[PDB]
């Protein structure tokens, strides 16, 4: 069923720096995709930063991986409308603990 449709995170957020599970940002570019640029989180460490500022292996930094909507080229390299796909992306990182 074909229907019609018209028209970095670091800019406004530095949680990637101040999280106890901090992360880097990867520029994922794809011109055959809309949006063209996706920013993908990569956790910096296995452990999490503790209250002394040190990497602490009593917990783990883990990515939050989410499926999100994008638009791709149904005929490859052909900008004549496109399919609606779902891709798995790391949106950020959180700190998981064994003590719950």
């Amino acid at each position, epitope marked *: 069923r074909t229907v019609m449709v018209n028209l970095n995170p670091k800019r406004s957020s530095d949680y990637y720096n101040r999280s106890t599970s901090p992360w880097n940002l990867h520029r994922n570019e794809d011109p055959e995709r809309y949006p063209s640029v996706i920013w993908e989180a990569q956790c910096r460490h*296995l*452990g999490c930063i503790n209250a002394d500022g040190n990497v602490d292996y*009593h917990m*783990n930094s*883990v990515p939050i*991986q989410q499926e999100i909507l994008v638009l791709r080229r149904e005929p490859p390299h052909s900008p004549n409308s496109f399919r609606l796909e779902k891709i798995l992306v790391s949106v950020g990182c959180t700190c998981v*603990t*064994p003590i719950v």
Partner: single-chain antibody
Amino acid sequence: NFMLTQPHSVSESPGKTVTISCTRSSGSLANYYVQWYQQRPGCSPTIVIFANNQRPSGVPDRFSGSIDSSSNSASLTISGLKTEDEADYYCQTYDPYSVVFGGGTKLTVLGGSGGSGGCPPCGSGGEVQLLESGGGLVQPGGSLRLSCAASGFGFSSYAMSWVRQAPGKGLEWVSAISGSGGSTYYADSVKGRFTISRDNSKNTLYLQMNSLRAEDTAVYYCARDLIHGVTRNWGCGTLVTVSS
């Protein structure tokens, strides 16, 4: 990396308290959580203490754990010993790259009999299910792929690992992988021969075993970890035999 040293065996009378200690050879013990596993003869291991001193539901409160940072050691204490406590107890901890089990301490409850125990279930209880398969007989230099089918939990949220045990011998950590599959870890003797991987859309964990050796013969267990190095649930194992 490091070793964990616990006694080969200990004996104590029923109704008394016994402590089993585990000394870490290198690295600071207080930097990494210590777990303790009970394994009865012929059974899968089961957790009795995780994160130094946490007790899962269903473990009697006569079990407790502690650490002594100055002697670089951890201890399992059993008060009010019952005959069903007779078993092999394994300590386990980790560092950023590897997981290590102690050699296992066989506890004898003096007086002979007056109880039993029984084996745990596969998956260590609850709704957690871990079903291994792929084991078989192979020639040296051969290949085998093991799989572990998981159910009852959000599979992509859990680090997983492979641990093996030759019949009559101790637990030996093999390999580990993060929930997303982006990080993998290997025991030294399997690097370059084994590959751990996972398929999160199929709830499946894999172990590709190339260049198989006679010393690779063992029951191979799938394991669910709360964080890297902290095993919470065990499968029932698949047998791999390597022989000429």
